């Protein structure tokens, strides 16, 4: 299939997205080939097919390997599975790839994660935008999906990227188009409220099961427990089918922020990230005093299998205060 390179004595989960941009799965330990690419075979592939002209990107925070197998031509981007790089790390990756690629037209980059799907697609699609093959994140993402997955142009773009992964490729597009490729200026914010619409059928259907964790730089910076008023104050409106919660004591936030919603309900499934729903945003790219995410823009409700629970008007809005000095 599309994911499989079966040629010249190799049998690998490896795709030429373009002639010079490869997406692949994790180069795995030992010789076993049952649903994995053995690192000895992957390193042999590159040394044979692209001698002295490859660079490998390992996007997994969870696992490295002996990079000397690849003649020390490995660059790590620490991304958790089903999550995103920081914008700083994304731009650093883009510059590293740019420097490498500009020096020789036969240079290649090989980007991998665990399966070579969501995290890989975030960086491959961003690279394709940088390299000018596409002008829009949507087209770059769909191209990656068309090459690396069963997705076909004209299909609903599902099964490839989390919602935040899609958002972060969009952030890169905005950085290229509006900020000259430079990191946007810092914006310091505090979250002061969260509003969730279409709450009926979600856990207890009134916010009472929910909690919200804010994470910055891989650390919890705030936890709110709605029923109890732990760092918050909950209001439920049955007629408007919504909960509104004042968020208290938020520290100053800057950069890439991850927000996770947890539940005590045994009727609300967990998706990725060990929670019912979550998302990332960057404070610098916030417009005005809030960010509102529709169902398709939130990680886990983005999957259609969940749409009996998260109905079409399910949204999450964060309200912010300006937290500059």
UniProtKB/TrEMBL annotation:
GO cellular component: membrane
Record's keyword annotation contains Secreted: no
Domain C2 tensin-type: 181-323
Subcellular location: Membrane
Main location: membrane
All residue ranges annotated as the Tyrosine specific protein phosphatases domain in the record: 85-148
Record flagged with keyword Membrane: yes
Disulphides: 60-113
Ranges where the Phosphatase tensin-type domain occurs: 3-179
Molecular function, one GO term: monoatomic ion channel activity
Record key words, sorted: Hydrolase, Membrane, Transmembrane, Transmembrane helix
Protein topology in the membrane: Multi-pass membrane protein
Name of this chain's protein: Voltage-sensor containing phosphatase
Lineage, opening ranks: Eukaryota, Metazoa, Chordata, Tunicata, Ascidiacea
Gene: Ci-VSP
Section covered of the full-length record: 251 to 575 of 576
């Amino acid at each position: 299939n599309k994911r499989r390179y079966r040629k010249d004595g190799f049998d690998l989960d490896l795709t030429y997205v373009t002639d010079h941009v490869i997406a692949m799965s994790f180069p795995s330990s030992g010789r076993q080939s049952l649903f994995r690419n053995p690192i000895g075979e992957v390193s042999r592939f590159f040394k044979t097919k692209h001698p002295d002209k490859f660079r490998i990107y390992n996007l997994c925070s969870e696992r490295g390997y002996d990079e000397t197998k690849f003649d020390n031509h490995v660059y790590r981007v620490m991304i958790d599975d089903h999550n995103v790089p920081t914008l700083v790390d994304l731009l650093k990756f883009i510059d590293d790839a740019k420097v490498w690629m500009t020096s020789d037209p036969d240079h290649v980059i090989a980007i991998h994660s665990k399966g070579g799907k969501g995290r890989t697609g975030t960086l491959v699609s961003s690279w394709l935008l940088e390299d000018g093959k596409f002008d829009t994140a949507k087209e770059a993402l769909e191209y990656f999906g068309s090459r690396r997955t069963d997705f076909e142009v004209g299909d609903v773009f599902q099964g490839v990227e989390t919602a935040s992964q899609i958002r972060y490729v969009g952030y890169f597009e905005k950085i290229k188009k509006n900020y000259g490729g430079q990191l946007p200026p810092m914006k310091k914010l505090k979250v002061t409220g969260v509003t969730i619409t279409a709450i009926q059928g979600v856990g207890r259907g009134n916010g009472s099961d929910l909690s919200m964790q804010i994470v910055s730089e891989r650390q919890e910076v705030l936890l709110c427990k709605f029923a109890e008023g732990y760092n918050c104050a909950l209001q439920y409106d049955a007629t408007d089918d919504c909960v509104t919660c004042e968020v208290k004591n938020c520290p100053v936030l800057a950069g890439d922020i991850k927000v996770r919603f947890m539940s005590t309900s045994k009727s609300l499934p967990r998706g990725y990230d060990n929670c019912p729903f979550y998302f990332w945003f960057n404070t610098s790219l916030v417009e005005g005093d809030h960010v509102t995410l529709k169902r398709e823009e939130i990680d886990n409700p983005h999957k259609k299998k969940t749409w009996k629970i998260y109905r079409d008007n399910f949204t999450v809005k964060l309200t912010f205060s300006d937290a500059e000095d």
